[PDB]
């Protein structure tokens, strides 16, 4: 997160860290959607051009954390992965279209003041909230600047951007499975996701029922917080069908 600030404790209880097991390293962010299911970005798990093809045994997750480094006794929980599910139409050769992935935990985690799932949006909620100019919130332990690592989880509020501005901001072919967000150069504020924040949630608090909904997954960008560029997020609702299918099948 570039140009963000420190999250308060318990501000984002669905935040999950995704580690490679051996050697242990923070690879990505992710979110908790139930006691046993975790959402993340597909390229965090599979990205051949960079020699990435992780399976269940290569990864672990940590839930309920605030500080990147220091251990938080009786707060944070660790879990292994029972199953990994990539979207079958994930396009890593072109533009990261459908950059989404589901991970089923070996053992359900217990909720607490620090561990609590985020809502997935229904149709009405998505139609109401994914509107240009409307602001969502992005969280992660990723880089603070374009290539540096925060001590505590970072948070930033960013407006959704009109689809034509998104199209004209990049020569990469964008799809309806993507949305972009960030401030325009004119608006005089800054903020962006950055390398390492992939898989983190783009959330919005619904004025109708005061529940937080995950509309997006940090997916990709060209640089971080560059003027005229925007960060791009996997459109969660557009793939919700797939999510439900997977969860109901397994």
């Amino acid at each position: 997160i570039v140009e963000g600030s420190d999250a308060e404790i318990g501000m984002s209880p669905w935040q999950v860290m995704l580690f490679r097991k051996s050697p242990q390293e923070l690879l990505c962010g992710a979110s908790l959607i139930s006691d046993r299911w975790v959402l993340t970005a597909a390229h965090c798990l599979l990205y051949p051009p960079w020699d990435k093809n992780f399976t269940e045994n290569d990864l672990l997750v940590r839930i309920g954390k605030h500080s990147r480094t220091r251990y938080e006794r009786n707060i944070e929980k660790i879990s292994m992965l029972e199953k990994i599910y990539i979207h079958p139409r994930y396009n890593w050769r072109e533009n990261l279209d459908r950059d989404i992935a589901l991970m089923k935990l070996k053992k359900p985690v217990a909720f607490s003041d620090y561990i609590h799932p985020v809502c997935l949006p229904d149709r009405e909620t998505a139609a109401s909230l994914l509107q240009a100019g409307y602001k969502g919130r992005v969280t992660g332990w990723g880089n603070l600047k374009e290539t540096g690592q925060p001590s505590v989880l970072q948070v930033v509020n960013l407006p959704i951007v009109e689809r034509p501005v998104c199209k004209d901001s990049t020569r990469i072919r964008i799809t309806d499975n993507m949305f972009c967000a960030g401030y325009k150069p004119d608006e005089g504020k800054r903020g962006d996701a950055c390398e390492g924040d992939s898989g983190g949630p783009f959330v919005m608090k619904s004025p109708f029922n005061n529940r937080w909904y995950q509309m997006g997954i940090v997916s990709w960008g060209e640089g971080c917080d560059r003027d005229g560029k925007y960060g791009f997020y996997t459109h969660v609702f557009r793939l919700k069908k797939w999510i439900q299918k997977v969860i109901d099948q397994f």
Binding site: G10, M11, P13, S112, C119, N157, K205
Partner: peptide
Amino acid sequence: ADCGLRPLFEKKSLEDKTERELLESYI
């Protein structure tokens, strides 16, 4: 489920430092 409602904020009738920015954007 019980989703999207935070123990330390919504369940304690307490506003997070910046969520009002989101609400006020929703106009």
